[PDB]
Symmetry: C2
Subunit: 690 residues, 2 copies
């Protein structure tokens, strides 16, 4: 099924301690802590590095040589074991960075999987349950279930036979020398993972593949497992979390009501364990952190999408914002154009804090903004902010070169819910909590009848657990069928991002492009151009919102006919984006239908600039004329712009005609076509007067 370096892999057998979990470093720490308590002197780092691989008897004799014959080693070792379980049971088993990402890839590739550990069945199961990785494994082979343990191949041969597989059909993951010998001898595809101590030359010669850590194997495995397809609407997010944090600089409409979905989907195998989002909206921050989750409402399908693992912070709080730019692997900048200059300072501090931190991986920075050269604006202000802060030209330029700054194109209209509407929701939801809290003390009491399975010692202990759980969880049972709605968004999925960052290569809701130019030109002419031309027609007819205007057959007919003429043109110019034009065309018409909230004024701002020769309106006309396509609705659209400028913005008609003739001259058209286009357009402008 899964092909790994030209070898068919049907199985994956993992060692537990030192391979899956970082429990060798914990045993390293607990031995030092246990020594400090009892004998007073702390067992040297160097001694413990020497004990890696050696038996408990050999380790004791070494301790006796260094720290005297009467050193209570068995006492220190027994204490260290108590501290290990004590720590693991409350704080959780330390999982190697990359394991869950690897397991999901192997599992979704249809591999049967086992654990081959020298630990006891009882303790091995608790650890795999504690870590929440037991779900990935079909069978477990343990040291107390074999005649001869590692480095004898029995444990790996048995694990393989239990999965209905020959050893040579299985990947075998291992850290220790004895384990690798066991795995190699069994005949499996051995994968040696360095834990603490550098592996000797014999181990590196023996192993089929060697990696410095789990994440290096994940990078290699990613070459043999596919990037998943574009997520559909109402498609679940992954169940399994990785150890990565991601950031949304600006928890606004687009940040909370789109980017959160892309990050929640991630690569389809895992998703980030924490999504940090910044906002000065205190009501939004406290509300989300109170619920521990918010939801995005998709009106068209009446679907409420639960975005979990969210942590909302204050944009003004320095310690929280630096924590985002220090711990995040990917950050999405989702601010308006007129907030870039001010926010560039707190970004510069964030990237400087990351540079000073001992954070080690380059940051992927997505620029989310509906402007041409949006990246340029952010980078220009970020450059100044870094110089102003550090006063170090070498460090400033290092930061700008180190990280991946990605230009993007987004095609999803989103509406952030008002504070009045949120308060209304928080009031009605709080009511249900009181209605829920008034009939949970009606139940009352906790009882466990004669089980005739559990011992009376642990039967009493079971009652205490369920009692404690019931008290804490029961009040939050209402969250099952209760969503904190903060966003109303359309169903447009794909985000176009500049290719470069390795971290984007597996993101399934992302569409990678070598240069953003092409899709940004489409966004300009097909989306923003039509949106402006439609908004000019909406305003003159005297409709409050562009959504209300679609009720008029004239407006809706114009919109459908206008996208058609622009598409026909762009299909010849960019035939490699044929599927993207057809998708975006329909995505625009769907969103325009009930676009009530967002006004026409914002969309219709600066009509003269938008009617430039190389801009969204006039460029489309010139393309259609050159290739002899219908441009009658584009001509009508161009006229509405000059008409809007005169009536609403109070611009003189002389200024409109002066501007027009200059643009027509610049267009790459025949002398005949120029005069024809001028004569037709001026007649439409003088009609809309009356």
């Amino acid at each position: 099924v899964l092909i790994f370096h030209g070898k068919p892999v049907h199985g994956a057998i993992f060692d537990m301690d030192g391979t899956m979990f970082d429990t060798e470093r914990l045993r390293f720490q607990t031995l030092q802590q246990a020594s400090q308590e009892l004998i007073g002197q702390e067992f040297s780092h160097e001694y413990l590095m020497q004990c890696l691989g050696l038996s408990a008897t050999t380790a004791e004799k070494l301790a006796q040589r260094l720290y005297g014959v009467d050193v209570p080693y068995k006492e220190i070792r027994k204490r260290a074991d108590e501290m290990e379980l004590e720590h693991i049971r409350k704080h959780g088993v330390p999982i190697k960075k990359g394991l869950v990402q690897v397991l999901e890839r192997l599992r979704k590739s249809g591999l049967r999987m086992a654990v081959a550990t020298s630990s006891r069945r009882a303790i091995a199961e608790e650890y795999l349950i504690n870590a929440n990785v037991y779900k990935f494994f079909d069978v477990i082979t343990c040291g107390d279930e074999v005649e001869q343990g590692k480095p004898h191949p029995e444990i790996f041969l048995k694990a393989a036979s239990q999965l209905h597989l020959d050893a040579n059909q299985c990947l075998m993951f291992e850290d220790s020398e004895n384990g690798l010998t066991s795995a190699h001898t069994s005949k499996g595809l051995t994968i040696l993972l360095k834990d603490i101590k550098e592996p000797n030359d014999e181990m590196l010669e023996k192993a089929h593949f060697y990696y410095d850590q789990m994440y290096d194997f994940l990078t290699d495995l990613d070459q043999f497992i596919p990037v998943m397809d574009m997520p559909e609407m109402q498609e679940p997010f992954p169940q399994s979390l990785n150890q990565l944090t991601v950031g949304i600089h600006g928890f606004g409409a687009i940040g909370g009501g789109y980017i959160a979905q892309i990050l929640s989907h991630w690569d389809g195998y895992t998703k980030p364990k924490r999504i940090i989002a910044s906002t000065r909206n205190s009501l939004f921050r406290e509300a989300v952190n109170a619920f521990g989750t918010y939801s995005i409402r998709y009106g068209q399908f009446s679907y409420d999408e639960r975005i979990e693992n969210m942590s909302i912070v204050d944009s003004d709080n320095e310690q929280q914002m630096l924590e985002m730019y220090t711990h995040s692997s990917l950050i999405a900048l989702c601010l308006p154009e007129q907030a870039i200059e001010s926010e560039s300072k707190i970004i510069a501090k964030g990237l400087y804090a990351r540079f000073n931190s001992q954070c080690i991986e380059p940051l992927t920075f997505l620029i989310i903004l509906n402007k041409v050269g949006a990246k340029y604006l952010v980078m220009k202000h970020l450059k100044e902010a870094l110089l102003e802060l550090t006063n170090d030209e070498d460090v400033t330029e290092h930061i700008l070169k180190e990280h991946y700054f990605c230009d993007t194109v987004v095609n999803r209209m989103v509406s952030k819910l008002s504070n009045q509407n949120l308060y209304r929701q928080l009031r009605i939801k709080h009511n249900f909590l009181e209605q829920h809290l008034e009939d949970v003390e009606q139940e009352d009491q906790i009882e466990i009848e004669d089980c005739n399975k559990l011992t009376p010692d642990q039967l009493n202990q079971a009652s205490i657990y369920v009692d404690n759980m019931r008290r804490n969880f029961q009040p939050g049972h209402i969250l099952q069928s209760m969503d904190l709605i903060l966003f109303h968004s359309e169903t447009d999925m794909p985000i176009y991002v500049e290719k470069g960052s390795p971290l984007l290569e597996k993101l399934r809701q992302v569409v990678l492009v070598d240069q953003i130019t092409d899709i940004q030109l489409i966004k300009n002419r097909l989306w923003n151009g039509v949106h402006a031309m439609l908004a000019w027609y909406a305003s003159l007819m005297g409709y409050e919102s562009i959504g209300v205007a679609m009720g008029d057959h004239l407006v809706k007919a114009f919109a459908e006919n206008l996208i058609a003429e622009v598409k026909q043109g762009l299909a010849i110019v960019l035939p490699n984006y044929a599927k993207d034009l057809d998708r975006m065309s329909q995505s625009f018409l769907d969103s325009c239908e009930y676009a009530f909230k967002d006004p026409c004024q914002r969309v219709a701002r600066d009509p003269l600039r938008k009617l430039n020769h190389n801009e969204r309106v006039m460029a489309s006309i010139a393309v259609n004329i050159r290739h002899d396509l219908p441009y009658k609705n584009l001509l009508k659209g161009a006229a509405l712009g000059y008409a809007y400028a005169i009536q609403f913005l109070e611009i003189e008609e002389t200024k409109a005609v002066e501007h027009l003739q200059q643009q027509i001259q610049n267009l790459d058209l025949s002398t005949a076509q120029r005069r024809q286009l001028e004569a037709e357009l001026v007649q439409l402008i003088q009609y809309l007067f009356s």
Copy 2:
């Protein structure tokens, strides 16, 4: 685009007061109490009936004609205060209707004469505001009901002609407003007997909301078999459903089928019954439990679960009185004792002034006969009336089922081990929480102060439960077999997604018993005696798979003679069984090998196959080995005495439809083979 009795429908506009919710009754009572403690003289019942589906401004005009702002204000305050305590009284079938129209791709709206502030407050509380694109209140409208402006404006804002829109209404005045708009009117009876003038205007009439739903449903496409990780519906209906036995099948299969339902709505609550108090208190404490599909490492959360005690009468009566569907998931051993609880439930259902779909989940040739026999004897004993019993029996739909899915119930030891580990995480989480919404962000200091109080005590109650985002209560290990096969009859089962209707259920149940459950038990006995604790691992052994394939061959050869019409499909069913067994690693042999003696009965999955093969002179060598291994397991693993196993062996062979020559030969061959296993 939807075709409702020929006419093409593009949209659907609903009235709120009396049509969607039963608020017309509430304001009927508040207006009377509002005119008692202010003016003294209460309103006449003529005035209130004339003020059905009227705006606050319109109702004021009629009041001055006969004889209001101050009166109606206090009436509204009384009304919404009742809603904040007892919730919005939603008309049964509303959420079911709305979702079907929404997924049909129709542009839906609301046309209510109530204020916007009032209209939204209820729509939000009912959680039905998400189903509507635009709403038209009795504020922005210049001339309200019975003038068609409010309905024309609602239709216009959807960007469709009024004649393309369905228009729901309860009131006489509102029905005129709907009719005069020139749309497809629908009338729902609430608190006024429809007049001649009303019934003539209306295109369709229904006694209640749920009657329309049934009529609409024949034009709504029935959704097909759900995929493995396909989500459940988001919107809940008002229907309850029950699971008589929270076991491996009930909790680990039926709960998924009921949670999927029709694909439009999901039952309000699922009531499951069990004596396992650990399982009961675990689910109720967490609020949810998850089914683990090990093959794809997928945890399927099942919510709206209420686990009750089987012994508790009132809780089992609550189940049988208010449930649209009950799933009987008990073994034969308990059928007799549990027939008493079923009798009381069905008798309590009749005494309470929609029929029941009763699913019998049992791996037995003729399972319904056993249940219906014990149920009749149970009812007759309590009721002491033959007239009431024969009605009950022939009223409700008692359906035979075939369950192919292999599911395992988690042991109490492993459930305690889970709770112990997960509790330590909760304790540490309650230390991390450790210990004020400032800045007027477009809100008044009064509201901002009130908001702080709401969020503070919301965090206080919710913050401890945040850990449940990651933490799941795993109670079942299941394979990815979706479709359940059920007997035809019940109209409800026609629309359920995971249900596949068949005619000849008996012939399928027989093959299921012999070829599936019989081989499953016999290879489990063989695997158990060899030291394997899991079916999945056991099938890795060449001898265990070879034995299973040999048994399959001997059973199929027999079934081919008994059912030649099913002989073509046997190879698919036998292969489908081996596929399920091959990688059933979390499915233990002990679960499959339960009740050896019961499964070695003369008319059961083992002895029946042997008898058929003997009669037709077919090879039954491996079948005889599996029978011997069945008694070998009983004596060794269960410890039931050797003498009792022989008394069972002799009694069953005596019952077998064979000649005395064949009976004595079979007994001689089998008892000899039992001794050979030990010695």
